[PDB]
Amino acid sequence: GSKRFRXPIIFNER
């Protein structure tokens, strides 16, 4: 569902 944001890339899990 989410995880973390990283400007150019966005990390999302569960």
Asked whether 13 and 1 are in contact (CB, 8 A), the reply is yes
Structure-solving method: NMR
SS3 label, residue 14:
coil
Whole-number Å distance between alpha carbons of 2 and 13: 5
Q: Which two tokens stand for residue 2?
A: 């989410």
Phi, psi of 4 (to 5 degrees): -170, 155
Please give the sequence-ordered ranges of beta strands (E in DSSP) within the chain, or none if there are none: 2-6, 9-13
What's the Cα-to-Cα distance from 14 to each of 1, 2, 3, 7, 11, rounded to whole Å? 4, 6, 8, 20, 10
Does residue 2 contact residue 10 with C-beta atoms inside 8 Å?
Answer: no
User: What is the spatial distance between Cα 14 and Cα 8, in angstroms, rounded to a whole number?
Assistant: 20
Cα-trace Rg, the chain = 7
Strand partners for 10: 5
